[PDB]
Design an enzyme around this catalytic site. Structure first.
Site, PDB file in Angstrom:
ATOM      1  CE  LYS A 135     -47.422 -17.002 -15.626  1.00  0.00           C
ATOM      2  NZ  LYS A 135     -46.491 -17.463 -16.717  1.00  0.00           N
ATOM      3  CE1 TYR A 141     -52.730 -19.637  18.393  1.00  0.00           C
ATOM      4  CE2 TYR A 141     -51.944 -18.682  16.326  1.00  0.00           C
ATOM      5  CZ  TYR A 141     -52.924 -18.789  17.304  1.00  0.00           C
ATOM      6  OH  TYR A 141     -54.093 -18.060  17.183  1.00  0.00           O
TER       7      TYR A 141
HETATM    8  C1  LIG Z   1     -58.394 -16.109  15.178  1.00  0.00           C
HETATM    9  C2  LIG Z   1     -58.558 -16.314  16.653  1.00  0.00           C
HETATM   10  C3  LIG Z   1     -59.602 -17.210  17.073  1.00  0.00           C
HETATM   11  C4  LIG Z   1     -60.172 -18.455  16.358  1.00  0.00           C
HETATM   12  O1  LIG Z   1     -59.176 -19.548  16.192  1.00  0.00           O
HETATM   13  P1  LIG Z   1     -59.286 -20.923  15.618  1.00  0.00           P
HETATM   14  O2  LIG Z   1     -58.028 -21.709  15.959  1.00  0.00           O
HETATM   15  O3  LIG Z   1     -59.553 -20.961  14.066  1.00  0.00           O
HETATM   16  O4  LIG Z   1     -60.416 -21.567  16.374  1.00  0.00           O
HETATM   17  C5  LIG Z   1     -60.210 -17.009  18.351  1.00  0.00           C
HETATM   18  N1  LIG Z   1     -59.704 -16.023  19.168  1.00  0.00           N
HETATM   19  C6  LIG Z   1     -58.617 -15.184  18.847  1.00  0.00           C
HETATM   20  C7  LIG Z   1     -58.011 -14.267  19.895  1.00  0.00           C
HETATM   21  C8  LIG Z   1     -58.024 -15.320  17.502  1.00  0.00           C
HETATM   22  O5  LIG Z   1     -57.043 -14.347  17.126  1.00  0.00           O
HETATM   23  C1  LIG Z   2     -45.778 -17.146 -16.815  1.00  0.00           C
HETATM   24  C2  LIG Z   2     -45.142 -17.450 -18.121  1.00  0.00           C
HETATM   25  C3  LIG Z   2     -44.113 -16.561 -18.537  1.00  0.00           C
HETATM   26  C4  LIG Z   2     -43.171 -15.717 -17.608  1.00  0.00           C
HETATM   27  O1  LIG Z   2     -42.048 -16.400 -16.852  1.00  0.00           O
HETATM   28  P1  LIG Z   2     -41.123 -15.843 -15.890  1.00  0.00           P
HETATM   29  O2  LIG Z   2     -40.105 -16.911 -15.505  1.00  0.00           O
HETATM   30  O3  LIG Z   2     -41.879 -15.308 -14.628  1.00  0.00           O
HETATM   31  O4  LIG Z   2     -40.579 -14.692 -16.682  1.00  0.00           O
HETATM   32  C5  LIG Z   2     -43.762 -16.567 -19.920  1.00  0.00           C
HETATM   33  N1  LIG Z   2     -44.383 -17.503 -20.709  1.00  0.00           N
HETATM   34  C6  LIG Z   2     -45.332 -18.430 -20.325  1.00  0.00           C
HETATM   35  C7  LIG Z   2     -45.827 -19.499 -21.263  1.00  0.00           C
HETATM   36  C8  LIG Z   2     -45.754 -18.404 -18.969  1.00  0.00           C
HETATM   37  O5  LIG Z   2     -46.787 -19.331 -18.609  1.00  0.00           O
END
Ligand SMILES: *Cc1c(COP(=O)(O)O)cnc(C)c1O
Ligand SMILES: *Cc1c(COP(=O)(O)O)cnc(C)c1O
Lengths: 359, 359
Positions: free
Chosen positions: A34, A255
């Site tokens: 899944k 940042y």
């Molecule tokens: C991704 C990024 C942006 C845009 O940033 P925001 O915080 O979503 O506005 C602009 N310039 C550069 C250099 C970036 O890597």
């Molecule tokens: C996703 C799920 C599993 C698997 O679980 P794991 O802890 O990742 O092995 C088995 N049965 C059901 C009902 C689930 O939703």
């Protein structure tokens, strides 16, 4: 160059299915696939395991996508169907389903099918998520054995809420409830997933449902890795450096100026961020392999990039291989360091990440 | 579909581009659509904004994917190119690029291209992530004006590390450094992204690069929303209930028994989990809209499901509409409740989420 990529080891996948058969020798296997096989890819993971007795999915969409790719083996709808108008497809596609509500039951009762469907009555034994509660189960169960549209016998399924916590009596209580309800009933029984398989041999019964451990990752919240159980890691989250720059003492990185260097050094920039699925929560110091050598993340993880501290005369160069987790660095080690569940780490990745399959 | 779906309002998208032109009236627009357009969809978001002066992407692959879909505006490679063998494609595709290292510059120096390429020299003014440091910038810059492979003039780009923190002087320091280097130079200048656009009108210059605010989400970490700036939210993360069950006092819910009820009540189960991109860190109490009414998340968020507390007597039922964030519920509120950045919430979603476009 290569950027965000998930490398899937088909050989390790095979090894794990077989290794789980050894650990649960009297139980059939429901390979749970899944969420895109847990970030490994839903159709490729299925095609790598033609030996699986069945495949488990969360939603009908996922099962149909398997059938579309040529997967032919029985697929188990773990949450059942969400619309009564889906029964005809379910029946025709030979999908096995869970039944946890009256909608689903009342639908099977009045549908008109050309073939009956194999069903697993979901019983709520403690998780209180999906399933029929104990005091409504006997009546609900009896209606299913009277459905001309349900293949007999009615199988019984359930799921553990705290199997990874052997010290609390949660599992022993669910097992007690599960066992009481199944007494005298024919039909397969299934309650164990990864945790139940590894820690509770009393819960194997007829079918076990390996999910996370199938991919060589431990479902446990302690420092354990899939190798603790003889399971090999299938996924490797990789990328490359896109820059190696000089940096000086007292200067911050990223940042918010989250990290400040105490020495002149060289910083590497990785073509990996949370826009790919890498946790934005990763704290400075989190390990990452650069040229097969561990270096720490310095500064906040951005949408597309991650900075690492290489060292003042580090000879790493733009283009060099980086491993976020995989060979040399288990995803469990990244989970511990970042405090993010290994389940989420391998699964919550975006479509920006390329997919590679080896062996 | 009725399960995991992202609904994208194309009309809010257009409103935001023009609202941003009103806030930065003397600057052209570089619509930033990296990381699948912040989870909204790379090619659909570009097609919704044929008015954008240019589009910004993180990687070459994203730009090529835009050309493949028919997008013709100029596309800006914000991190430049990772391989010298890419220059021929970049030249032919009319991609504009950033140049931050020597590998990129040396590539431009000795490549043979049928057409020169438009370039933006990336200057490190304080972020210490990508870019040429001040003391190496003048020599590096001069080599770019001597390239016949570079379309003159050489443009200058930079990025803020803490523009969302108006009280620290980091931004005025980057601006000071940016301004000093640009003195007497002939190309376009660009340093402002969402934060710089909204809080620093002296950083608008020739081109501004709106990213997050373009999608109607606030860049800042205080509690303000896109509506604080006249920008309308574009994304709505939606799903449906797949079960409404009875629950009793003293009974826990989900993995780890994280939440225990103090009344008898009814629980709703949502077809949404972190296998879709919803934060597994979401604490009990986080808001969700069920039938346009806010209910709290109770218990751990699983890979495919989320439980909510509806009430003892509540009339919601399997199939009913659920909004994780959207019309009644800004993603910024979910970020506060979740302590997860809005940037990561809208962007780190998986391929199992369906995409709808309205208006
Ligand atoms: C991704 C990024 C942006 C845009 O940033 P925001 O915080 O979503 O506005 C602009 N310039 C550069 C250099 C970036 O890597
Ligand atoms: C996703 C799920 C599993 C698997 O679980 P794991 O802890 O990742 O092995 C088995 N049965 C059901 C009902 C689930 O939703």
């Amino acid at each position: 160059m290569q950027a965000a990529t998930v490398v899937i080891n088909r050989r390790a996948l095979r090894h794990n299915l077989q290794r789980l058969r050894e650990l649960a020798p009297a139980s059939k296997m429901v390979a749970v696939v899944k969420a895109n096989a847990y970030g490994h890819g839903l159709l490729e993971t299925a095609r790598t395991l033609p030996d699986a007795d069945a495949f488990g999915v969360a939603r009908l969409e996922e099962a149909l996508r398997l059938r579309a790719g040529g997967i032919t083996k029985p697929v188990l709808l773990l949450e059942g169907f969400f619309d009564a108008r889906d029964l005809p497809t379910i029946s025709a596609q030979h999908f096995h389903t869970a039944v946890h509500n009256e909608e689903q039951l009342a639908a099977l009762e009045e549908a008109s099918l050309d073939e009956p469907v194999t069903v697993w009555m979901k019983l709520d034994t403690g998780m209180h998520r999906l399933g029929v509660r104990p005091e409504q189960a006997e009546a609900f169960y009896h209606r299913l054995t009277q459905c001309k549209n349900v293949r007999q016998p009615v199988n019984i399924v359930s799921h553990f809420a705290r199997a990874d916590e052997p010290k609390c009596g949660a599992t022993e209580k669910q097992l007690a409830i599960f066992n009481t309800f199944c007494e005298g009933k024919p039909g397969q029984r299934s309650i164990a997933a990864s945790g139940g398989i590894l820690l509770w041999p009393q819960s194997h019964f007829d079918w076990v449902r390996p999910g996370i451990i199938l991919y060589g990752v431990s479902p446990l919240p302690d420092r354990s890795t899939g190798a603790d159980f003889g399971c090999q890691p299938v996924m490797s989250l990789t990328s490359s450096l896109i820059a190696v720059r000089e940096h000086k003492a007292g200067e911050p990185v990223g940042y918010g100026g989250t990290w400040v260097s105490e020495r002149d050094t060289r910083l590497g920039v990785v073509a990996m961020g949370y826009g790919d699925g890498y946790p934005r929560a990763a704290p400075s110091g989190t390990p990452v392999l650069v040229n097969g050598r561990e270096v720490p993340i310095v500064g906040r993880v951005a949408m597309d990039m991650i900075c690492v501290d290489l060292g003042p005369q580090a000879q790493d160069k733009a283009g060099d291989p980086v491993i976020l987790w995989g060979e040399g660095l288990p995803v469990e080690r990244i989970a511990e360091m970042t405090k993010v569940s290994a389940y989420e780490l391998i699964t919550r990745l975006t479509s920006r990440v390329a997919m590679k399959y080896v062996d």
